[PDB]
Design brief:
The complex is a heterotrimer of chains A (276), B (100) and C (9). With 276 residues, chain A is of the alpha+beta class. Chain A has an eight-stranded antiparallel sheet with strand order 4-3-2-1-5-6-7-8. In chain A, strands 9, 10, 13, 14 and 15 form a five-stranded antiparallel sheet that branches. In chain A, strands 12-11-16-17 form a four-stranded antiparallel sheet, with no helix packed on it. The longest helix of chain A has 29 residues. Chain A is globular and about 65 Å long. In chain A, 33% of the residues are buried. Chain B has no helices and nine strands. In chain B, strands 1, 2, 5, 6 and 7 form a five-stranded antiparallel sheet that branches. A four-stranded antiparallel sheet of chain B has the order 4-3-8-9, with no helix packed on it. Chain B has 100 residues and is mainly beta. By secondary structure, chain C is low in regular secondary structure. Chain C is 0% helix and 0% strand. The chains are: A alpha+beta (276), B mainly beta (100), C little secondary structure (9). Chains in contact: A-B, A-C. The interface between A and C is medium-sized, with 31 and 9 residues.
């Protein structure tokens, strides 16, 4: 199937408490592989997946250089955002950045991304064509014009269609055991009386990778979102994911209810029913 | 400026079996800004040797962290996650339910 | 693998 590489960066100002904190984190699909934290002693980009330890030592020096340049740049971008929004130096603010590339199962470039958020709101994003920018407000329109004038879309396109995909494909090979695995969910159903009169049926998907999954309830084979609870997909901490979906049911009518599990690792959707 | 209040899930890595070594997870997600305090509690007191993931965020820019520790569930030992954020008047405690 | 150039707002 398709694969994604994503770098996520967070810069947080803390006036009177030193320079902003910069955290960067790198992912391939739902698996983290690097970090950098300007507060940590190493002052190095660090591995967070076994397979990235195969990169040579030159890699660690190069990524450390570049993430430090990102750092110094987003520290200044916090001060530029202050000016544009006309805000005091007394308050803490957040600049988030995301970028990276998608490839098909053939390994060909699919899609490129490069976007910012200020104080948790969309600021600017590179559009699908990788030739143009969406700006959320007049401050981002200042950035949009600067970046058009300086051909920023062209520099970022050449990275996303080039080095980015090269990197993602090398990672997919060096970490094939991890990244290209497909762990189907292990599913079961639990039953929890609420009363003499009603019970919760809970449908479980455990140990699955990657994290994309769909859990659906039906009653007599028609979709059910009434009395349905669906929790966020959640990490187990071992590189796999968990999810459940629940219905409260008239006790003695359990068998009307089917749970349906869709996941890349199942050759076919699963139907679960209540089995004493 | 957006502010988003954390969502909290407390759960075991593996199906709880009383007296078998497991991991206790607290997943805090959907929050903004990023400053957050998380404690894992056994019977109301702080666990010392808790670890967390590196700060990342979702499509909507909202942050997520996993906090975890090795633990051995019993029938009677009560575990919880205590979360403090600028959006909360006071810490939110979510008790671990082995069935959730 | 990171890019070399990071733009100013």
């Amino acid at each position: 199937g398709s694969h994604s590489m994503r770098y996520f960066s967070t810069s947080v100002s803390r006036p009177g408490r030193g320079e902003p904190r910069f955290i960067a984190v790198g992912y391939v699909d739902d698996t983290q592989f690097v970090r950098f934290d300007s507060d940590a002693a190493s002052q190095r980009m660090e591995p967070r997946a076994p397979w990235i330890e195969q990169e040579g030592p030159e890699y660690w020096d190069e990524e450390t250089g570049k993430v430090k340049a990102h750092s110094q740049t987003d520290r200044e971008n916090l001060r530029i955002a202050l000016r544009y929004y006309n805000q005091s130096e007394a308050g803490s603010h957040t600049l988030q950045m995301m970028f990276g590339c998608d490839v098909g199962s053939d390994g060909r470039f699919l899609r490129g991304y490069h976007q910012y958020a200020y104080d948790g709101k969309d600021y600017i994003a590179l559009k699908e064509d990788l030739r143009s920018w969406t700006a959320a407000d007049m401050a981002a329109q200042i950035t949009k014009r600067k970046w058009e004038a300086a051909h920023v879309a062209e520099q970022q396109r050449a990275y996303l269609e080039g080095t980015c995909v090269d990197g993602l494909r090398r990672y997919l090979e060096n970490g094939k055991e991890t990244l290209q695995r497909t762990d189907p969910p292990k599913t079961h159903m639990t039953h929890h009386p609420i009363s003499d009169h009603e019970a919760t049926l809970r449908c479980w998907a455990l140990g699955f990778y990657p994290a994309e999954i769909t859990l659906t309830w039906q009653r007599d084979g028609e979709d059910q979102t009434q009395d349905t609870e669906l929790v966020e997909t959640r990490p187990a901490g071992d590189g796999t994911f968990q999810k459940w979906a629940a219905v409260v049911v008239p006790s003695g009518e359990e068998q009307r209810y089917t749970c349906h599990v869709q996941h890349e690792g199942l050759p076919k959707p699963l139907t679960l029913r209540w089995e004493p | 400026m957006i502010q988003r209040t954390p969502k909290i899930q407390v759960y075991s890595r593996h199906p709880a079996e009383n007296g078998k070594s497991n991991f206790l997870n607290c997943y805090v997600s959907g929050f903004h800004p990023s400053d957050i305090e998380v404690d894992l509690l056994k019977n109301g007191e702080r666990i010392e040797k808790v670890e967390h993931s590196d700060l990342s965020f979702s499509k909507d820019w909202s942050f997520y962290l996993l906090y975890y520790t090795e633990f051995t569930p019993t029938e009677k030992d009560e575990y919880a996650c205590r979360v403090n954020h600028v959006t909360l008047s006071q810490p939110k405690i979510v008790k671990w339910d082995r069935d959730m | 693998q990171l890019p070399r150039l990071f733009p100013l707002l």
